[PDB]
Antibody
């Protein structure tokens, strides 16, 4: 089937550079236009740039014109977005897409997206504290940067009743979230509840036992 | 240079309802309009192309139509899995432009929250900060009022809220409110209370604890 797979995002300093890649499978990018579309946190979709790989003709949004360069290598079936002079306003999930049927099918296939965070703040792994206890219990995942973190319970064996809240940005500039779960009161003190926290940007993995 | 004015910005409908989302192009765009669905944490998904054509694999309850510069996405029988943000798009000219989006939530009966309060852990206190967490579990509608009282004094500026996306199975929301204090300030007070006001509650519910007890 058709696939578009992005790579290259991450945390970068303001004023810096970063190159994203979009690897196409199941079709030849010589046949279509390839696009980059981005989405700032909590905002809508914004087209960034397009390229026609056969002749390399490009178009850009005014917001990135001159700073960004879209390119493609048909022999690698891959397109690229070279980002320069990066600003905080460029923080977004970057998607690549194609025009299907020379545009008739619009953007029919999209990549999974790659998160680009433009910030001067350093990476920091979270501290994990128990939210001790139908009963409710959880874990407080505090003071980390950048996004994202993932949380599971009992290595995935506990899923029903779990609510992992979206992170909030604290006044300190660090993120924080809680993950909670409701369980039968009769299970406390014997059944073990462990939250599994992963923060890939800082290479931090924490398993925290939550005891009453 | 062509704008897409999408309405409404958000809507709530019950399962089985017929949903209408509209998009008005600022000038003629022929039929070069597409509709997309985007669920939380996922890439957009094509629903309709060339104004009125159902895209491969998309359920038949989705349909699109055009009248002049006005474009309409219809969901004939709203399903719980249709909770998402919907976007129109024109590609008659460059740049292709998107509508601002329509947030679609599933309407359901009122459900009161289950409320829980959590004191700061002894491990966090040793670090020097104290976080107090109030949980509102599985409620509807989304709107709720959560106030913190410390020694019966109303708090301001020291709490942050987070709300989950609508649950796929029961269409409820859950909410956390987190009060942040220094360890020194936390140890200067006794009663920590979160008071919850919600349509599903006859009167506000208060959950509290006394520090140390």
């Amino acid at each position: 089937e058709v696939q578009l797979v992005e790579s290259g995002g991450g945390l970068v300093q303001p004023g810096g550079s970063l190159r994203l890649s979009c690897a196409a499978s199941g079709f030849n990018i010589k046949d279509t236009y390839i696009h980059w579309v981005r989405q700032a946190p909590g905002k809508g979709l914004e087209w960034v740039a397009r390229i026609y790989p056969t002749n390399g003709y490009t178009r850009y949004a005014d917001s990135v014109k001159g700073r960004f360069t879209i390119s493609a290598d048909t022999s690698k079936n891959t397109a690229y977005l070279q980002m320069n002079s990066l600003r905080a306003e460029d923080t977004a999930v970057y998607y690549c897409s194609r025009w299907g049927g020379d545009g008739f099918y619009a953007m029919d296939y999209w990549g999974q997206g790659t998160l680009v965070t433009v910030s001067s703040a350093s990476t920091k792994g979270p501290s994990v504290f128990p939210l001790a206890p139908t009963a409710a219990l959880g874990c407080l995942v505090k003071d980390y940067f950048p996004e994202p973190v993932t949380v599971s319970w009992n290595s995935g064996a506990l899923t029903s009743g779990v609510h992992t809240f979206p992170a909030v940005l604290q006044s300190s500039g660090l993120y924080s979230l809680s993950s909670v779960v409701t369980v039968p009161s009769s299970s406390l003190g014997t059944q073990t509840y462990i939250c599994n926290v992963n923060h890939k940007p800082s290479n931090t993995k924490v398993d925290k036992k939550v005891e009453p | 240079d062509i704008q897409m004015t999408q309405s409404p910005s958000s809507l709530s409908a019950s399962v089985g309802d017929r949903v209408t989302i509209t998009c008005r192009a600022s000038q003629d765009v022929n039929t070069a309009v597409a509709w997309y669905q985007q669920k939380p944490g996922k890439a957009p998904k094509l629903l309709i192309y060339s104004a009125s054509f159902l895209y491969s694999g998309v359920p038949s309850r989705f349909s699109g139509s055009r009248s002049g510069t006005d474009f309409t996405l219809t969901i004939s029988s709203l399903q719980p899995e249709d909770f998402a943000t919907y976007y129109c798009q024109q590609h008659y000219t460059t740049p292709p432009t998107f509508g601002q989006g329509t947030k679609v939530e599933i309407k359901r009966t009122v459900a009161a929250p289950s409320v829980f309060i959590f004191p700061p852990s002894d491990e966090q206190l040793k670090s020097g900060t104290a976080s107090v967490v109030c949980l509102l579990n599985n409620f509807y509608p989304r709107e709720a009022k959560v106030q913190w009282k410390v020694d019966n004094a109303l708090q301001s500026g020291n709490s942050q809220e987070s709300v989950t996306e609508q649950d796929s199975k029961d269409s409820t929301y859950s909410l956390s409110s987190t009060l942040t204090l220094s360890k020194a300030a936390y140890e200067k007070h006794k009663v920590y209370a979160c008071e919850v006001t919600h349509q599903g509650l006859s009167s506000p519910v208060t959950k509290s604890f006394n520090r140390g007890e």
